[PDB]
Design the sequence.
């Protein structure tokens, strides 16, 4: 999968010039044609500001006006129509009309937009062009792209190239070169934020206190997320800290996450006041960081959903999941911790013994010294702590028990144990933020 | 410590307007005065492109010319004394001069300049105004800030705010708001890339390839890196993988790194041709990723220099280092691994036994036929692998050995063990 992403300002105001890139030359007002010629991307994404729109009879007429103008410009230049146009909510008071709202809305909106576009399976070659973009939307677009590609890199190889052209001086210019200003092997960065307080999902930009309170108190998301908050943070921590059993047991419901994001996005959309005569858009609600954390969480869940299996979890499964989610000292520590439980199950098998619903402490042979569940022991032992995990060996007829024990050995958290682990991982995730 | 950084273009062409920010107002051509008023920074950094230069007599008369017109402008709207001016290398064909080179030189130059300004002790509150610079110079300045602050965040609390003003649209503008476009607590990100091949430190832009090879051959930096590359990657791995004894034993020579960076820097500068009659600057060398890695490596060393304890390396000292350097599962991993050696040391102390210069495997009482040093055992056991570490307990008269054993029990790698750990950690950093 090759992806081309370009950040555009007022594309209509650009002058004709010549562009050098990768042994090709191009006449025209935009880099997109030559970019598409040289790179030959599988898909193109154009990101520009609302503030180019000149129709205020509705919000849907404003997006469609900007879209048509972009499609018309794609015909003017050699550009293909295989593209997604993200119309970002931009700020400023212009001659053709006024746009008020939180500046940060552009980031959350583009993050949301790209989280529905960037494929969640297979490798990713991403190309980002900033040659004639607005400074702040290009920063926020750049930021939103890197935040999702960081999560994508957990499961797949991701390569990021950025471009910018030589600056344009009028009539002095002859052939502007398109420079490569970044070539990056994107580092795997799983989500490492907790879900924030319920003030930080939607905030009031230009709205009376009581009307915001009503909208806020109308949201099913905030209500449902109050009692789900701990389980989701436990799941975020499972990737961050190397807890493969918690990853499987706490795997979130993608349907509910979709539902939470859809609702917050619809509410934000519904609160955009478009006054038709005086030519003015007011975004009466602002997106908060909690919206962003939800978009990243859903995306990470989509990226890792191929690993989830049904409830009996074998040692062999925990190995294969771990080898995909984890790297460096984290992966090697998880393999050593699982191995210790494996070597014990091999021993049990050679004696023709196959325990059922046995605490891991009783399985491994533990003193009656320490039954209290500590952060130290939960985080240092890949979450496979002896007082919270239950083991089951499914009886078989051994011949080569060293290779058969992992398939027949299953680990699960006790109802009480799971709740103790959720508290520790949730607290650890907030303490590291 | 509070730090303001601004990305500036042709600051002279700026028209007078008024700005709002944090319940305050200000009238002037730039936002620096009101940002300074509301934020009250302890220090301010201005990043400019050198592409506003006009007098092409030499390199030092371009950076002179640009610096003059900046210091005049800072006095005109009172930006004060507490200001560093970074004149980054820009490219483009302009009305009063031509500037040819790698676009990415602006990143490596700003990265190098910021690495000398950002304080390496204490917490950091960083403010970044992107209002008005060259698109790509502002982007590379932002990237250069985040890359360095990520390393700072390993040891100190780091919060980063970004701003962009409402677009100045000259016919209709009455005032412009300074909008917060970012507010983030910066996540701790240790350096996590190996040192590249000796082609990726300085690269030819417009230099004949025969001349490059000649000058590449004359650099005492690349010859010294031949020896030290693997020892430096071992240290990079120590932070990333939680290997506290390797962090201390491989701790890099800050002075030596300064001089490597200084030689690549002034060799780059020395290859900038200035043609006064044609009015053309040409940067015939470009900085490579390896110059970037060295700058980040030197900064990470400065950030963590406080943790290089006096020898010998006691369990007590190793806990103290680890408690500062590691977080999450990595920290708890290291505490449990050091705890195993401590509990053993306590056992020995209670029996009036004080083993001297004994392999860790003998100290812990290991079986035979597990003498092979694996990646798995080096990385899973916080680098305290039983076949590469040597233990010494300095003899004492114990009273409460549970408290005393940690201070009197010292660990080092054997010379043979160290090179195996270097090979494994270097290899592991490359596969990453
Ligand atoms: N006192 C000041 N004097 C002069 N400039 C100031 C001052 N204070 C702040 N600035 C900012 O400094 C940058 C240079 O003037 C400006 O920043 P930015 O607005 O981000 O500039 C980017 C260009 O605005 C252009 N575009 C002009 N029309 C509109 C428009 N109607 N919808 C959105 N963008 C517009 C964009 O089209 P493109 O891609 O050709 O170039 C961009 C100014 O907002
Ligand atoms: N076909 C095209 N038609 C129109 N623009 C194009 C086209 N292709 C590329 N562009 C670029 O797209 C942005 C919008 O026009 C421009 O780049 P941007 O970085 O946004 O430049 C904006 C201003 O150029 C100014 N400044 C002009 N001289 C120099 C200079 N020599 N040293 C530093 N800055 C310069 C900057 O000073 P400030 O802070 O007032 O605002 C910037 C253009 O260079
Ligand atoms: N509370 C605890 N104290 C010490 N070791 C533990 C604890 N919980 C788990 N472990 C060890 O983590 C491994 C995976 O479950 C397993 O190997 P072990 O060393 O036999 O004891 C377990
Ligand atoms: N090759 C190895 N195989 C198994 N365990 C090891 C090895 N090397 C080190 N360890 C264990 O790492 C800990 C810190 O040295 C220490 O505690 P242990 O579990 O007694 O054995 C050691």
Sequence:
């Amino acid at each position: 999968m090759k992806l081309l992403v370009v950040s555009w300002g007022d594309f209509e105001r650009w002058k004709e010039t010549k562009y050098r890139f990768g042994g090709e030359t191009s006449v025209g007002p935009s880099t997109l044609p030559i970019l598409q010629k040289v790179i030959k991307p599988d898909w193109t994404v154009i990101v520009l500001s609302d503030t180019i729109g000149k129709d205020f009879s509705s919000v849907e007429t404003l997006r469609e006006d900007v879209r048509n103008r972009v499609m018309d410009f794609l015909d003017r230049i050699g550009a293909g129509r295989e593209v997604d146009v993200i119309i970002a909510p931009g700020i400023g008071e212009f001659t053709h009309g006024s746009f008020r709202g939180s500046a940060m809305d552009a980031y959350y909106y583009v993050l949301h937009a790209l989280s529905e576009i960037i494929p969640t399976k297979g490798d990713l070659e991403v190309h980002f062009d900033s040659t004639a973009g607005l400074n702040y939307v290009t920063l926020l677009t750049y930021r939103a792209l890197k935040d999702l590609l960081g999560i994508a890199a957990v499961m797949n190889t991701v390569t990021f190239y950025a471009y910018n052209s030589d600056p344009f001086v009028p009539k002095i210019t002859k052939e502007l070169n398109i420079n490569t200003i970044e070539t990056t092997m994107v580092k795997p960065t799983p989500l490492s934020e907790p879900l924030p307080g319920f003030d930080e999902y939607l905030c009031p930009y230009s709205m009376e206190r009581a009307e915001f309170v009503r909208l806020k108190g109308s949201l099913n998301t905030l209500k449902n997320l109050r009692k789900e908050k701990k389980k989701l943070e436990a799941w975020i921590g499972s990737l961050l800290f190397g807890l493969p059993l918690l990853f499987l047991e706490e795997f979130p419901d993608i349907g509910r996450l979709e539902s939470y994001i859809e609702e917050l996005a619809e509410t934000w959309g519904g609160a955009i006041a478009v006054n038709a005569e005086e030519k003015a858009v007011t975004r009466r609600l602002a997106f908060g960081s909690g919206f962003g954390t939800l978009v990243k969480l859903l995306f990470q869940a989509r990226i890792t959903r191929g690993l989830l299996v049904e409830e009996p979890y074998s040692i062999e499964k925990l190995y294969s999941v771990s080898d995909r989610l984890f790297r460096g000292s984290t992966l090697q520590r998880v393999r050593v911790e699982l191995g210790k439980i494996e070597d014990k199950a091999i021993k049990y098998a050679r004696k023709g013994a196959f325990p059922r619903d046995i605490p891991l402490r009783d399985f491994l042979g533990f003193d009656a010294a320490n039954r209290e569940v500590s952060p130290r022991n939960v985080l240092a032992h890949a979450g496979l702590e002896a007082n919270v995990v239950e083991v089951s060996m499914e009886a078989w007829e051994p011949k080569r028990p060293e290779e058969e024990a992992g398939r027949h050995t299953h680990l699960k958290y006790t109802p009480v144990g799971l709740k103790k682990v959720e508290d520790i991982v949730s607290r650890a995730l907030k303490e590291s933020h």
